[PDB]
Design a protein around this ligand. Structure first.
Ligand SMILES: *[C@@H]1O[C@H](CO)[C@@H](O[C@@H]2O[C@H](CO)[C@@H](O[C@@H]3O[C@H](CO[C@H]4O[C@H](CO[C@H]5O[C@H](CO)[C@@H](O)[C@H](O)[C@@H]5O[C@H]5O[C@H](CO)[C@@H](O)[C@H](O)[C@@H]5O)[C@@H](O)[C@H](O[C@H]5O[C@H](CO)[C@@H](O)[C@H](O)[C@@H]5O)[C@@H]4O)[C@@H](O)[C@H](O[C@H]4O[C@H](CO)[C@@H](O)[C@H](O)[C@@H]4O[C@H]4O[C@H](CO[C@H]5O[C@H](CO)[C@@H](O)[C@H](O)[C@@H]5O)[C@@H](O)[C@H](O)[C@@H]4O)[C@@H]3O)[C@H](O)[C@H]2NC(C)=O)[C@H](O)[C@H]1NC(C)=O
Ligand SMILES: *[C@@H]1O[C@H](CO)[C@@H](O[C@@H]2O[C@H](CO)[C@@H](O[C@@H]3O[C@H](CO[C@H]4O[C@H](CO[C@H]5O[C@H](CO)[C@@H](O)[C@H](O)[C@@H]5O)[C@@H](O)[C@H](O)[C@@H]4O)[C@@H](O)[C@H](O)[C@@H]3O)[C@H](O)[C@H]2NC(C)=O)[C@H](O)[C@H]1NC(C)=O
Ligand SMILES: *[C@@H]1O[C@H](CO)[C@@H](O[C@@H]2O[C@H](CO)[C@@H](O[C@@H]3O[C@H](CO)[C@@H](O)[C@H](O)[C@@H]3O)[C@H](O)[C@H]2NC(C)=O)[C@H](O)[C@H]1NC(C)=O
Ligand SMILES: *[C@@H]1O[C@H](CO)[C@@H](O)[C@H](O)[C@H]1NC(C)=O
Ligand SMILES: *[C@@H]1O[C@H](CO)[C@@H](O)[C@H](O)[C@H]1NC(C)=O
Ligand SMILES: *[C@@H]1O[C@H](CO)[C@@H](O)[C@H](O)[C@H]1NC(C)=O
Ligand SMILES: *[C@@H]1O[C@H](CO)[C@@H](O)[C@H](O)[C@H]1NC(C)=O
Ligand SMILES: *[C@@H]1O[C@H](CO)[C@@H](O)[C@H](O)[C@H]1NC(C)=O
Ligand SMILES: [Ca+2]
Ligand SMILES: [Ca+2]
Ligand SMILES: [Ca+2]
Ligand SMILES: [Ca+2]
Ligand SMILES: [Mg+2]
Lengths: 674, 1080
């Protein structure tokens, strides 16, 4: 299909020139005037040239499925895939996932214990029965643990004056305990009596800085199975609050710069060192919770949901739900959590070295045609329902042997994948026919391979010697070319290209016609630099993740897409992580045209249509205002103020979202007349 | 690349936190903070003053005030240069207001020509809380006068615990009548308020509790009686029994107490309150929650027991209407958390101010500080940290502050404020993206070209999460004009470090390699298990920064004891006094000075005597190698065009080692050196400013196989000038983006025939296909189609050279995928500045091919045109063609082509919102005319100070009737009174029908006024505001026989279209429209 020659002095070097490059071993396939390079081409070309099909070496990439003995589950297979991977030739194998078998489950509740949570605290103190009852509808013998959080105890996070550190809750009361970061209420267990014994036991507390230091908690949670203990089995966490949360960089406010250790430094079941470490970073716990296989559940007030919603894309193994100031639906919430948490199947991998790339297809059993995305991801997949993750592995180099794991997110199942390079095709050796090459070399798959001082189709010539004039009618491309093109001192009808001892300068080719330099340049580098791509005979062959004449661009479109995940709003289109925004719409994501005629005046009729149900568009409304949705709440965009069908100054905010003539309106219920 | 990791200085000092912050001060010292150093009892913060000559550090002897307690100074640092000034801060100043503790901020302002100041000048005074408290006294006859006296001494008992002037009282006694014994006004003025309690005597009588309360609410809590405007309002009712005979119900009166915001406490005395109904009456007296506000008292004795705890309860004052929230103001700003000088005066960072929304304080020269932040309109800015990071942006004049909010809605945000009128306002804003990315953690303004004006700002996010690498920096161009701020480029670190903290620290190192472009430093102290690393980046031509680093110094490479290397950066100053900028880097326990090395730029001139090898020499004479021919190579080396940073000694002398190589990388060296048997020659020679030129003699053999490929001489060379005379200075080096291998060609004469003379005849001619007018900045590449043809000898090494001005140069293009009869050709080009004033020559060799004497070849050559290319109004480029055999004749092949040059602009005008849309009238007053105003808004968004002309069209007369009247153009700001007006007769039409369909009045039917206001120099980013003003008559409307006519004016920007052209597409935006509506 395609074969461009890099230096071809053997079968291997033919192979390293690309996936479609094949090597003919037929002896004296080389025409006396057709030198060795001609043996490396596409398979159809070698066949047309008379090469016997069985003499065409073509290492092909393949995957070997060695399934792991017997006994256990039929949930994730195959368990061992060995790869024989040829550079540029994709090695694709198929992973079957069919979770059916229920497994045990540990649930650990994380309680905001601030002054705002008393209406939640009294309620959940008495629910341990319903909790075990609901868990064991699906799993067998669920378990319950408990910890709680407020914040770091030093100023500016909670007040440290002794009277206030004593009664941190409002002066209106006792029945409160001094402020704390994360207290540990013993272990996950098989008793809701034990739940009552210690959960009803301890007091509410309080804070000063509104956000909650609950990320110190979860870092200590994932760091103390010696002091808590989890069963390997499902590991769930419930983050519950009316408020937000602190993260890394906030601890500077209390003159504590050192970022989080991640080590359980726990004493008597309380995070004692917490005022000596910053909060962990958002991703720091997305990673640490993935390490120990924990799925957090976000049990937060309706006014925090949008911000907790955003935490499912940094940790895919998490769930988000809205619930009452009462905690009156934490049961229904966790039912929904598991329902759609287990409805997601994610497939990711270990730290691939730069030499390798893995991509995924993802066939959702509910008919979702989907291929070619670097993430195994399908949704709504029921119970005992097999789905498909085709794993395509493509390598750049002739890589070292190497093993890594592909893992399902949420589980400890492991598919170990092993990578072998396919570079050296199989041939005979120097024990066969030391007469050809004249005892100054040896033979491999046809062509003689010569010792350091010998050259020629049969190693007859030597490097300190002559050339030949009629052979120099072949040692040049054509009548109008130069012999060897310059750049080569010719010998024996073949060229020996010159040495330029400068960075990345090789001259190569049948007539020294090519190089590794004279390609297009990007940034200030050859083909955008060695990371972005490579230079071969005037053209760039770009590395995975890059494309372009000089590897100018990234294959990624995630740079043209907005949080809604649409390319360039709906007002432009995507070119190299960049939007090209029509009219006056501006960079980056083409959302805003800060200059267009602001469209208030033509949406008079539409505004009074939709809130006040009057104006010319009565009975006309919906169809006469098709791009407009009306919002219960104030929106962010463009202030409008203008006179309606009766003369009243209707004030409203007009916010364009993705598309041509498409808006949200907040209308002030107040008119304004005279 | 020139940051020197060999000869550094490292200050390691074991004070707690030493090096967590550091700045360069006064071209002399590196000033190191140590926020956690214990200098005295309950005092933290240490400051150190290190110098390069000494190599050791001294603590700074400040007289540190006791009012500020563990500020932890050193945590925040800043420095400036106009004269030398250091600004030190510990913004965790603990402050006790009795029961509560706060963090105010204290900064010191030091200087060598001054004495230390302290910001803010005032220490922060405790909040206090104004409270207004009325006792309501049941004086009914059922109370014994021995009990009445106990209660009144309970009243003095309670008042004694409330220190005025924050607390004021008022007293009323009630029964069957009501007795104001003293007003708030009277309580305040007395020097012994309690004396008024004495001068009181019991009323006896019935019990009209509700009337008394209504009496209090509408009288005692009125400001007339001394009640304070914004003050907590409390009413304490004390009674021994139910209301009885009370003509008013509590249901009737209570609403006014709640409507005004008055706390209702109930004190009930006696077992009369033990039962169900009396409990419920106490509920109506008191406010809900009723436990909090009702206290049952046994006789008049237990009264004194609750005293202290009732004290406590009332002290627990707070707003309750909006769920007792934690809403603050300037109590815990930690003022001076982020410090950043300006020409106006210092700027200190307010973080926790206004429930952690934030802001910052400007301190003008010895006068009233001002507070920058967003207004209370922007609800969403709570808990953001706006001011955590603060940095100065500076264009040609007006200052601007950028402030960073790590936590804005848990993501991040940074906001530009400038000064509108005399008042600070938001110029523009830009957000983070990843939630918890902590965008705004870092701020650094970069002047990429060093024109004195900030070109762009870098914004950190050091915990940004991607599976392999941690952090990033946003390269954000300054918007100018009130327009959307955006960011262009994201930077990243060497991956394999998911929490490396890339984008933590920033600093402008300046111009470092001599290229007139700015170089910046980025901290990643978390890399390699928090060992730390520093990155060096280069500023691209134009407003952006390199997508890649050019040096990465991990502290791990520097030393086995380095942690958190790169936690802090301050670059820009000659601390070592050796001519070059130094870089100050903090690490956990030590601060380092890194130095730039000088970057020398070497010029290379190569030539042969003679041009080519004549056959006379190349020919054999039967004896091998006899009478070898002598040829000279003459090379000049100079060191120039980028001295820039340097002058005089050290810029001069620099020794260099030369390596010449005849016919290199080939088996058959066809020449040798006369000075030494060998293809190669090496010597050591001295450069200064004007070149060093040398003749080298080539011995070429008589019999030589190849007389076609020219003999090539190559130039490897390296600096070996180890001892240069001044500063004990560092190893000078060569630009690592520059080239060190240079060649020259010695071609041979060629036999065109044993009986033929050899005259080569080549002609060349090129074009620009498809091109219309040339627009700088719109057209970035120029596509030259060069045809060249041979009408003579076969041409070897066919060489085409171009003449073009500096603003453009050749970019290699590749074509492929079978397409075309086009340029599939391989070749080699070189651009090189030549001549006197601004032109270049790009010279291109067709290689591999012999250009045969009867064929032609056409090929493509593309020139990148700088968007800021200064071409003049005409672009001329030329073309020479020749062979490697050097043009032995007179009339030149030169073909040349000259174009007109246009330059890109971006001009916009828009309809302003403040316009009288819909005027009105009705049946009656048609003679009346009414003041009507349209307003238009124009902005130079482009790159060029171009003149423009603003044009307006205003209907003034329709079919003889005045429409608008006495229109004038008001141009307020920059009132260059030039406008021009011309009346215009209208396009004759059937105006009844024309207005019938689309009832709009514009210049198509109306006799119009055309206004031309010429802007003599509409410099970039300048805004102009133009308004059209005049009484719109009503009388013409009856002519058109409709009820709903509208009236429209138009605006259009014009400029010299021959010189400038506006950017393509965005060209509608210079013609705008505003409408007013008339309704009968
Ligand atoms: C960026 O930075 C800006 C500015 O720095 C911040 O914006 C500011 O937010 C602050 C929020 O706390 C505001 O401070 C409060 O101010 C109240 C009075 O404000 C000041 O200004 C007064 C006049 O200013 C207005 O009017 C002028 C014209 O005269 C105008 O030019 C201004 O623009 C301003 O306009 C207002 O109105 C328009 C439209 O109405 C609106 O658009 C504006 O936004 C403004 O709202 C001035 O008279 C005051 O000066 C005196 O009064 C003080 C009174 O305490 C006194 O202490 C001072 O010493 C001084 O003598 C003042 O300077 C003030 O009432 C607030 O006080 C509450 O909070 C304090 C703590 O801060 C508490 O200790 C108090 O107890 C009090 O809370 C209690 O009462 C309320 C209810 O109040 C009573 O009234 C009700 C009826 O209305 C009764 O029923 C009820 O029972 C109460 O008796 C309860 O809710 C509480 O629970 C508690 O019980 C507070 O100090 C500041 O004004 C404002 N700045 C501006 C320009 O608006 C931004 O927030 C910041 N950005 C971000 C994102 O944070
Ligand atoms: C400003 O900077 C100064 C620097 O000097 C800071 O001063 C340090 O302040 C801290 C307090 O924040 C001191 O802390 C110490 O507490 C240590 C142990 O804490 C534990 O013990 C407490 C003991 O109290 C109980 O038990 C004893 C038994 O004898 C009884 O007498 C008591 O009544 C209590 O029942 C526990 O309460 C507590 O929970 C801990 O378990 C102890 O080792 C120290 O001696 C000191 O008490 C610290 O020592 C101070 N150092 C110095 C040199 O002054 C100051 O805190 C900073 N500013 C602010 C606002 O904190
Ligand atoms: C057009 O192409 C021709 C052919 O190559 C160029 O002519 C060459 O021009 C250079 C100068 O750029 C001449 O070098 C000169 O050498 C003399 C020798 O005494 C010296 O005194 C001068 O100061 C200069 O260095 C070179 O001789 C000349 N060669 C030929 C064959 O004409 C020409 O420069 C190109 N066009 C332009 C605009 O330069
Ligand atoms: C459970 O996983 C933990 C790691 O968190 C490990 O210590 C333990 O060995 C696992 N369980 C069993 C039964 O081995
Ligand atoms: C309804 O809208 C159409 C155009 O959308 C318009 O022609 C018609 O007059 C409207 N009806 C009323 C009653 O305003
Ligand atoms: C000083 O430190 C001590 C603790 O050692 C503390 O009790 C005291 O309050 C501090 N400062 C003042 C002003 O009292
Ligand atoms: C006249 O203008 C006023 C506003 O100034 C408007 O409210 C009124 O409706 C107009 N007249 C009539 C008759 O509507
Ligand atoms: C012009 O208009 C103003 C206000 O609209 C009015 O006071 C004045 O009388 C008018 N003058 C004429 C000549 O109509
Ligand atoms: Ca609650
Ligand atoms: Ca600049
Ligand atoms: Ca530079
Ligand atoms: Ca220096
Ligand atoms: Mg009584």
């Amino acid at each position: 299909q395609e074969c461009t020659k890099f230096k071809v002095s053997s079968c291997r070097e033919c192979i390293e020139s690309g996936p479609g490059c094949t090597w003919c071993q037929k002896l004296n396939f080389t025409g006396p005037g057709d030198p060795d390079s001609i043996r490396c081409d596409t398979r159809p070309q070698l066949l047309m040239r008379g090469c016997a099909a069985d003499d065409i070496m073509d290492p092909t990439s393949l995957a070997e499925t060695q399934e792991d003995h017997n006994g256990g589950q039929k949930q994730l297979s195959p368990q061992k895939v060995t790869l024989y991977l040829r550079p540029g030739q994709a090695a694709a194998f198929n992973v079957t996932f069919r979770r059916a078998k229920g497994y045990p489950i540990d649930l650990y509740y994380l309680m905001d214990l601030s002054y705002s949570m008393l209406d939640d605290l009294r309620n959940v103190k008495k629910l341990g029965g319903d909790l075990l009852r609901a868990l064991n509808e699906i799993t067998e013998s669920g378990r319950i643990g408990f910890g709680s959080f407020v914040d770091k105890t030093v100023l500016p996070f909670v007040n440290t004056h002794p009277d206030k550190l004593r009664n941190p809750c409002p002066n209106k009361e006792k029945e409160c305990q001094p402020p704390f970061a994360f207290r540990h209420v013993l272990k996950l267990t098989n008793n809701s009596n034990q739940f009552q014994t210690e959960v009803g036991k301890q007091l509410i507390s309080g804070n000063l800085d509104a956000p909650e230091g609950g990320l110190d908690a979860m870092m200590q949670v994932a760091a103390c199975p010696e002091e808590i203990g989890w069963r390997n089995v499902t590991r769930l966490l419930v983050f519950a609050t009316d408020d937000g949360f602190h993260f890394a960089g906030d601890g500077k406010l209390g003159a504590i710069l050192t970022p989080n250790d991640g080590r359980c430094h726990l004493e008597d079941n309380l995070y004692k060192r917490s005022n000596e470490f910053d909060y962990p970073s958002v991703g720091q716990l997305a990673h640490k919770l993935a390490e120990n296989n924990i799925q957090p559940i976000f049990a937060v007030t309706s006014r925090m949901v949008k911000t907790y919603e955003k935490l499912t894309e940094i940790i895919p193994k998490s769930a988000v739900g809205e619930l009452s100031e009462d905690s009156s639906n934490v049961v229904q919430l966790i039912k929904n959590a598991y329902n759609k948490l287990s409805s997601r199947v994610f497939l990711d991998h270990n730290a691939l070295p730069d030499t390798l790339k893995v991509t995924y297809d993802s066939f959702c059993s509910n008919g979702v045609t989907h291929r070619n995305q670097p993430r195994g991801d399908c949704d709504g997949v029921q119970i005992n329902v097999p789905i498909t993750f085709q794993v395509k592995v493509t390598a750049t180099e002739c890589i070292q042997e190497q093993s890594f794991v592909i893992r399902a997110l949420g589980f400890t199942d492991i598919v170990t994948v092993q990578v072998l390079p396919q570079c050296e095709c199989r041939c005979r050796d120097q024990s066969r026919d030391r007469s050809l090459c004249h005892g100054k070399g040896f033979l491999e798959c046809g062509i003689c391979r010569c010792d350091t001082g010998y050259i020629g189709k049969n190693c007859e010539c030597q490097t300190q010697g002559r050339s030949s004039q009629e052979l120099e009618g072949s040692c040049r491309k054509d009548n109008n070319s130069i012999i060897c093109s310059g750049l080569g001192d010719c010998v024996c009808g073949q060229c020996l290209c010159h040495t330029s001892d400068v960075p990345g300068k090789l001259i190569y080719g049948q007539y020294c016609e090519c190089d590794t330099i004279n390609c297009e340049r990007y940034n200030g580098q050859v083909c955008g630099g060695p990371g972005r791509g490579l230079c071969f005979c005037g053209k760039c062959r770009c590395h995975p993740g890059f494309e372009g004449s000089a590897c100018q661009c990234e294959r990624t479109t995630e740079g043209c897409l907005n949080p809604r995940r649409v390319e360039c709003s709906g007002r432009g289109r995507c070119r190299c992580n960049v939007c090209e925004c029509h009219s006056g719409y501006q960079l980056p994501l083409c959302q805003e045209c800060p200059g267009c005629p602001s469209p208030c005046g033509k949406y008079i009729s539409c505004a009074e249509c939709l809130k006040f149900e009057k104006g010319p568009f009565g009975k006309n409304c919906s169809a006469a205002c098709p791009g407009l949705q009306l919002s219960n709440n104030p929106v962010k965009g463009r202030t409008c103020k203008e006179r309606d069908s009766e003369g009243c100054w209707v004030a409203y905010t007009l916010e364009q979202q993705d598309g041509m003539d498409r808006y949200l309106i907040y209308v002030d219920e107040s008119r304004e007349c005279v | 690349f020139n940051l020197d990791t060999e000869e550094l200085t490292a200050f390691r000092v074991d004070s707690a936190g030493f090096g967590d912050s550091v700045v360069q001060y006064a071209n002399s010292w590196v000033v190191v903070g140590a926020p956690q150093k214990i200098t005295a009892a309950n005092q933290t913060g240490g400051l150190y003053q290190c110098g390069y000559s000494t190599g050791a550090c001294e603590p700074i002897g400040l007289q540190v005030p006791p009012e500020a307690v563990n500020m932890s100074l050193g945590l925040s640092l800043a420095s400036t240069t106009s004269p030398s000034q250091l600004l030190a801060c510990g913004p965790t100043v603990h402050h006790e207001c009795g029961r509560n503790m706060y963090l105010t901020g204290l900064c010191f302002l030091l200087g060598p020509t001054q004495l230390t100041q302290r910001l803010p000048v005032s220490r922060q005074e405790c909040p206090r809380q104004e409270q207004d408290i009325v006792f309501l006294i049941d004086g009914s006859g059922s109370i014994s006068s021995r009990n009445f006296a106990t209660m009144m001494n309970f009243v003095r008992a309670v008042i004694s615990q409330f220190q005025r002037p924050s607390t004021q009282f008022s007293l009323m006694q009630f029964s069957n009548k009501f007795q104001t014994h003293f007003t708030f006004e009277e309580f305040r003025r007395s020097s012994n308020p309690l004396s008024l309690l004495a001068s009181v005597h019991q009323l006896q009588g019935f019990t009209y509790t509700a009337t008394a309360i209504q009496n209090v609410v509408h009288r005692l809590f009125h400001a007339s009686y001394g009640a304070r405007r914004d003050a907590a309002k409390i009413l304490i009712v004390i009674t021994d029994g139910k209301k009885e005979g009370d003509s008013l119900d509590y249901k009737d009166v209570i609403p006014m107490a709640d409507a005004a915001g008055i706390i209702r406490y109930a004190i009930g005395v006696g077992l009369a309150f033990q039962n169900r109904n009396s409990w419920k009456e106490l509920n109506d007296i008191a406010s809900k929650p009723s436990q909090e506000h009702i206290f049952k008292v046994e006789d008049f004795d237990a009264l004194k027991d609750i005293q202290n705890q009732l004290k406590e309860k009332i002290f627990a004052i707070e707003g309750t209407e909006t769920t007792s929230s934690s809403s603050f103001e300037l109590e815990m700003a930690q003022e001076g958390f982020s410090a950043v000088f300006t020409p106006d005066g210092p700027v200190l960072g307010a973080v926790g101010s206004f429930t952690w929304s934030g802001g910052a304080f400007l301190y003008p020269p010895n006068m009233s500080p001002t507070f920058i932040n967003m207004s209370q309109e922007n609800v969403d800015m709570r808990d953001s940290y706006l001011g955590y990071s603060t940095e100065l942006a500076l264009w040609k004049g007006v200052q601007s502050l950028v402030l960073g909010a790590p936590r804005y809605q848990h993501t991040g945000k940074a906001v530009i404020f400038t000064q509108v009128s005399r008042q600070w306002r938001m110029k523009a804003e830009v957000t983070g993206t990843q939630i918890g990315s902590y965008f705004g953690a870092s701020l650094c303004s970069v002047d990429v070209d060093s024109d004195g004006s900030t070109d762009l700002v870098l914004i950190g996010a050091p915990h940004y999460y991607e599976q392999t690498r941690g952090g990033q920096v946003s390269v954000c161009p300054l918007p100018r004009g009130w327009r959307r701020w955006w960011c262009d480029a994201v930077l990243y670190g060497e991956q394999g470090h998911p929490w490396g903290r890339f984008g933590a620290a920033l600093t402008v190192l300046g111009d470092v390699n001599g290229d007139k472009l700015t170089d910046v430093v980025i901290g990643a102290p978390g890399e390699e298990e928090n060992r730390g690393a520093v990155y060096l980046f280069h500023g691209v031509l134009g407003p952006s920064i390199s997508p890649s680093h050019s040096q990465r110094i991990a502290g791990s490479q520097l030393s086995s004891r380095l942690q958190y290397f790169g936690q802090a950066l301050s670059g820009g100053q000659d601390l070592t006094q050796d001519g070059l900028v130094d870089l100050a880097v903090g690490a956990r326990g030590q601060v380092l000075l890194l130095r730039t090395r000088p970057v020398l730029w070497v010029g290379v001139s190569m030539q042969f005597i003679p041009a080519e090898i004549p056959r006379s020499a190349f020919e054999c004479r039967e004896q091998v190698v006899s009478e070898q021919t002598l040829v000279q190579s003459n090379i000049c080396l100079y060191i120039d065009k980028r001295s820039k940073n340097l002058l005089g000694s050290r810029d001069l002398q620099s020794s260099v080692t030369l390596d010449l190589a005849l016919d290199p990388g080939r088996l058959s060296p066809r020449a040798t050196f006369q000075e030494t048997k060998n293809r190669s020659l090496s010597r050591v020679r001295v450069l200064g400013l004007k070149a060093h030129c040398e003749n080298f003699n080539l011995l070429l053999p008589s019999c030589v196989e190849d007389s076609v490929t020219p003999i090539t001489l190559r130039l490897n060379f390296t600096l070996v000038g180890k001892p240069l005379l001044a500063f004990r200075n560092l190893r000078p080096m060569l630009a690592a983006d520059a080239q060190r291998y240079f060649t020259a060609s010695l071609p041979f004469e060629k036999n065109c025939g044993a009986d033929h003379i050899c005259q080569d005849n080549l002609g060349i001619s090129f074009s620009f296909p498809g091109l219309k007018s040339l627009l700088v900045g719109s057209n970035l590449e120029l596509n030259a189609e060069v045809m060249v043809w041979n009408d003579g000898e076969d041409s070897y090494g066919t060489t085409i050279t171009f003449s073009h001005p500096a603003g453009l140069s050749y970019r290699y293009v590749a074509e492929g995928q079978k397409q075309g009869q086009l340029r599939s050709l391989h070749l080699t080009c070189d651009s090189a500045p030549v001549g006197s004033q601004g032109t270049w020559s790009t010279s291109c060799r067709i290689n591999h091919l012999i250009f045969r004497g009867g064929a032609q070849i056409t090929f493509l050559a593309t020139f990148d045109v700088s968007p800021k290319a200064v071409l003049g109004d005409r672009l001329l480029l030329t073309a020479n063609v020749s062979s490697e055999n050097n043009t032995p004749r007179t009339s030149k092949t030169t073909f040349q082509l000259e174009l007109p040059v246009k330059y890109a602009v971006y001009t916009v005008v828009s309809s302003h919102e403040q316009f009288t849309k819909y005027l009105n009238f009705s049946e009656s007053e048609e003679k009346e005319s009414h003041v009507a105003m349209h307003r238009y808004q124009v902005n130079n968004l482009g790159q060029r100070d171009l003149p423009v002309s603003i044009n307006f069209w205003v209907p003034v007369e329709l079919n003889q009737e005045a429409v608008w009247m006495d229109v004038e153009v008001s141009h307020p700001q920059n009132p260059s009174l030039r406008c021009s007006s011309e009346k215009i007769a209208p396009p004759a039409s059937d105006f009844l029908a024309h207005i019938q369909k689309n009832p709009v009045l514009d210049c198509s039917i109306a006799g119009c006024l055309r206004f031309r206001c010429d802007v003599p120099s509409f410099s970039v980013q300048e805004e102009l505001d133009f308004t059209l003003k005049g009484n719109l008559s009503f009388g013409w409307v009856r002519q058109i026989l409709q009820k709903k006519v509208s009236v429209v004016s138009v605006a259009e920007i014009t400029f010299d279209t021959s010189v400038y052209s506006q950017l393509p597409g965005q060209e509608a935006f210079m013609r705008a429209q505003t409408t007013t509506v008339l309704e009968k």
